């Protein structure tokens, strides 16, 4: 089996806020997950980070801290909230911080980025988002090429569904960006009756298609569920969805 | 279940012209179809539009009228056959007229198009065809963008197979044009042993692919059979093909 | 069933070189293949061309001879090794000679190529390779378009996996080049844990995708296993793999 993560936003923001994120960690371990993705927008709440760290450690889970933070500001400077967010993430027991790109300047100071990352013990993940600045193949390809040149402790999170918001083809993205991918965010996307894009659980067809996309990324890369998980028995549901994802490969 | 149409060309041009298109209406209704797509080229002489409209209504079907007319002439003017075809379609009972684009000029008179459409009671549908002028993604994107800006009462018919004639990817077309799609033409396409592209009935794999394409169009969009339906028992065959398409998507 | 070929490189180059390519023909015929693809690079010494041809004919197999030869030299001239390679292919009983493109010049002498090829019963196939000069859609499309204008009876070997090495989409390749394809090389490609591209046997999803790619090529085109075939029982392994390829197409 390949390593599987669950983004707790999958369970619904209201439910997660009400029950607290730490309460989902035993559920994830019991369902067979290897990693949890925490969500900054989902603490009620100023968290007991100590209690949260102890919970992750007890379950033997890896932990990704996901933030809506955009790395680069309109003005061309690294987001001053980067270090405060890294501290937050580390305090919660995360091994990775996941962010969006923001607006990549013509001249990014990746040396500066490195120095800030070096003050903390987290690998940085940068995810394609739904915006023009952070969600399009061309600028992301530029960022990852450069980042690799200066050898940053950073990797791409390839979000399968987000490309849809920028009318970018996931297959083309995978072909061009797949060598940089360290984490896959899985969701299916449909256009609803009013023409609006909405994230949904995968069909059997989507899953087979995702297996083909995964051929473009290093074998065994961690894959995350970030789509609705709703049902009366969340443990059994999560287990069945983890198994389906873990099984994707050659 | 999603609404399903059958294009009567599916039954074979010679057979349909022989028996007449009206004779297939009870078949379509009994087989579970919600619309009939009449084909201008399959009328053996001008129809009694009153008997036709009455037969369609008796069967509780809606009706798309399909013409091979190209909307824009080589010289950049609208095809003068547009309003005569709109009048014939409307008289036969259709809710939509389906046409091809023709050669979109540098400065298309979309206001004049709107004025002509406003004189009739049908929605205009423009389908991708098999030609360079009417069958390539870039020009169709330009057309539908400009039509939406003019707020015209028109939508795309997305023909899954026709892209093959222009060596365009349906997946790419669906990404770029999906927001505009109000009707889907379903057909599988193979290159035969002689080298010629031909429309064929879908395999299981084809249906799964089409399910993924439909994610790009508003959920529950009407879908039409436009591939060969040939056999000893057209009711049974039609019923099965309709059922497979009615439940595609969910 | 559609005709299936096995490229003998599938069995592992060292194993094949040591046993000789002729020793695999009974296996191919018993497992249900229609065609063997011989590999010039898998002859450990000069071939016994008469015994090879006799072994192919005994088994009732057809034969494609694969050469790493590049058709067009850097200086724009046709590779002078083409004639001896065509004769070698014929000596080994081949109905097709498969080569790489090389560097396509601005004004290739396709007329001369056609006159050369017309002296031979076999057909020339040009395969997409893993190089910029021979593995990119645009130049290959230019080659086949020029060949079609000159009315040459040559065709393409569409290698499904090779496109990955040049970061080219196989679906786009199949759309733009499909009309030219007379032979298909099947392999799946993944990035390994180290990030290196490697050719591998297909998953069920791969096979389903390949069925869709085949829609772009003339129906019934011969398709070849060109991916690892390893096991204690090559006969049953080969038979299962040939079967899965032979049934790919429309119902
Ligand atoms: Na090859």
TrEMBL record, chain C:
Q: Which SUPFAM superfamilies match?
A: Xylose isomerase-like
What is the protein's name according to its record? AP endonuclease
Give the species this sequence originates from: Pseudomonas aeruginosa (strain ATCC 15692 / DSM 22644 / CIP 104116 / JCM 14847 / LMG 12228 / 1C / PRS 101 / PAO1)
């Amino acid at each position: 089996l390949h390593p599987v993560s669950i983004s707790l936003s999958s369970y619904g923001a209201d439910l997660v806020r009400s029950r607290g994120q730490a309460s989902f960690l035993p559920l994830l371990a019991m369902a067979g997950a290897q990693r949890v993705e925490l969500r900054e927008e989902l603490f009620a709440g100023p968290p007991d980070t100590e209690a949260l760290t102890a919970a992750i450690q007890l379950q033997g889970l890896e932990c990704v801290f996901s933030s809506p933070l955009e790395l680069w500001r309109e003005d061309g400077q690294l987001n001053p909230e980067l270090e405060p967010t890294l501290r937050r993430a580390e305090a919660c027991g995360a091994g990775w911080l996941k962010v969006s790109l923001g607006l990549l300047p013509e001249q990014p100071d990746l040396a500066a980025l490195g120095r800030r990352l070096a003050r903390h013990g987290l690998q940085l993940l940068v995810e394609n988002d739904q915006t023009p600045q952070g969600g399009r193949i061309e600028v992301l390809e530029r960022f990852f090429r450069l980042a690799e040149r200066q050898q940053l402790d950073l990797a791409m999170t390839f979000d399968i569904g987000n490309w849809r918001w920028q009318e970018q083809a996931a297959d083309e993205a995978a072909l061009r960006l797949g060598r940089y991918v360290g984490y896959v965010h899985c969701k299916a996307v449909i256009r609803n009756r009013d023409g609006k894009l909405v994230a949904v659980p995968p069909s059997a067809a989507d899953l087979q298609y995702w297996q083909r996309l995964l051929q473009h990324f290093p074998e065994g890369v961690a894959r995350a569920i970030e789509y609705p998980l709703q049902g009366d028995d969340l443990l059994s549901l999560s287990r069945r969805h983890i198994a389906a994802l873990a099984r994707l490969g050659q």
